[PDB]
Design a protein around this ligand. Structure first.
Ligand SMILES: [Cl-]
Ligand SMILES: [Cl-]
Ligand SMILES: [Eu+3]
Lengths: 314, 328
């Protein structure tokens, strides 16, 4: 098929090495436009993001998935500018993160479905840029509104073929909650990535999800500020026979306003490699532990392309 | 000084009959741009707002204050488009309403002060349109974050001369708690309007604030869910007191000698997404006059009750101009 990016559709063969869970900027809807000086300037943030993406591209990355939603301050014009200047494909996201404003959290499941469909089928804002993934975040115990969001995401995925990525905040597991809801809606597990899965060491829980067909997002590796321990989960799942169900990423960004001021400086001090951490540190580490090149290319190239390719029949 | 509007600065003489507490659209940051079809379309929202403001203009309205903040979905390009097509002055707002996203509610008092000053002194987003008022909202008991917002508002007002308008969510009487914080920062009461003060009939509360020099926002006059008892969402939003009851608070404050402290408005809007779906239709059914309710129904009601025309012109023209004019 073809995959929608912020610069238009691309073919599966163009996707290449893909980081499945990233952001350019973690913010709030409208905030970058209303207070760019919070980031120094818009120009300073663009320059930082372009340098960071060029560095990742020189380490082999060809595509990132920016999973920022409306309520995380997704600015698709920023994504398009950085994508062109860095020559890295960026897939944009619809969905709902953990800070929905009243105009979102007052909505019914049917209205949320129509919102997701608008961003996937017509475009984001007035840009014509279409989302290629649906991002949902939940908390420990799924709230009633978070359940609406998951069901709307399943309905939008079933209508368009685009995949869903999800994570549970403040709890190790929680994938079982989401899996139950997604399956009640008829969604195929092969369209769902259970993200932040490197945050738990319960390997039997991850193996059980993989066996049901879910993709396992090991996508917070550099956030253990031990990263080697998290990366060994990749090896463990390969050894259980589930190399085809693994997605790897950094969950990095280049500006952040939704937490404490200057939290970006904290993150940059613990991981100065940025989104190059996966290609420069994790892949060599796994190679040294005996994972073949062919398996590594399956995880970083084959698996993301299969996931992102719109598939209504899976 | 002159007053900043979404079309640029105007002199005090051009302000005229003013509605001091209105909105074009009650929404969330970015939402009108991300899902305009929630309102039919952006074009339909503009047309509805232009038609409504032109009717208010025909009825004598010359200026409205749109108190929408960043987190209430303020879209200053929308305000400018509608102001120009209706030919009605619109004053835009900075501040913080009741639904701040994390990028706002994680900020310190010093950061919030800088944000307000940016919107007052430099402009909103990349438009160069400058805010002419600061809007703050609190809940019953001022939260820690809301206290930061009030102190930043006071600090920004003292730096720029721009006034502050408040309200408290519900029928709660929060003016005394807000006033205490504002005065601890050295802000003059004459730069503050205690909005939505018509939610209560506690005349002792209203008069004591007016006696300190606060402006009293009697600004939800048409809001009333009488007849809509089977609609629980309307009752919670609009209350159960008749519009005449709200309007007679105007007369009561005049009769105590505080005509110079009154500001009147409708608290209307032409689209709303921050509440239940289609709530716009409930509001429009209750008050088909929209923003023209004040000039068309309340003013002649108060004339019938014996208030002189010169006093009504003082409330609708003189008081808002004194209030909006930056002073410091
Ligand atoms: Cl996320
Ligand atoms: Cl308001
Ligand atoms: Eu993330």
């Amino acid at each position: 098929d073809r995959i929608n990016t912020v610069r238009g559709p691309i073919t599966i063969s163009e996707v290449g090495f893909t980081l499945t869970h990233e952001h350019i900027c973690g913010s709030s809807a409208g905030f970058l436009r209303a207070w760019p000086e919070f980031f120094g300037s818009r120009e300073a943030l663009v320059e930082k993001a372009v340098r960071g993406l060029r560095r990742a591209r020189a380490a082999g990355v060809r595509t990132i998935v920016d999973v920022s939603t409306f309520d995380l301050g997704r600015d698709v014009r920023l994504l398009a500018e950085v994508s062109r200047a860095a020559d890295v494909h960026i897939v944009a996201a619809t969905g709902v993160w953990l800070d929905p404003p009243l105009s979102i959290r007052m909505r019914s499941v049917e209205e949320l479905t129509q919102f997701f469909l608008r961003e996937i089928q017509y475009g984001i804002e007035d840009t014509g840029i279409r989302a290629g993934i649906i991002k949902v975040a939940i908390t420990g115990k799924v709230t009633p509104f978070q359940e609406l969001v998951l069901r709307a995401a399943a309905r939008a995925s079933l209508a368009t073929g685009v995949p869903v990525i999800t994570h549970t905040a403040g709890s190790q597991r929680g994938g079982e909650q989401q899996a139950a809801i997604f399956e009640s809606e008829g969604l195929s597990p092969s369209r769902v990535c259970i993200g932040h899965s490197d945050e738990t060491d319960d390997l039997s829980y991850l193996t059980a999800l993989a066996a049901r067909g879910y993709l396992i997002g090991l996508d917070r590796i550099p956030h253990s500020a031990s990263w080697q321990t998290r990366a060994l989960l990749i090896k463990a799942l390969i050894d259980q026979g589930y190399m085809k169900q693994i997605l790897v990423s950094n969950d990095w960004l280049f500006g952040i306003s939704s937490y404490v001021t200057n939290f970006m400086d904290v993150m940059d001090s613990v991981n100065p490699d940025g989104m190059a951490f996966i290609p420069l540190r994790v892949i060599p580490f796994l190679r040294e532990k005996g994972i073949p090149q062919e398996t590594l290319a399956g995880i970083t190239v084959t698996n993301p392309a299969r996931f992102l390719s719109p598939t209504l029949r899976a």
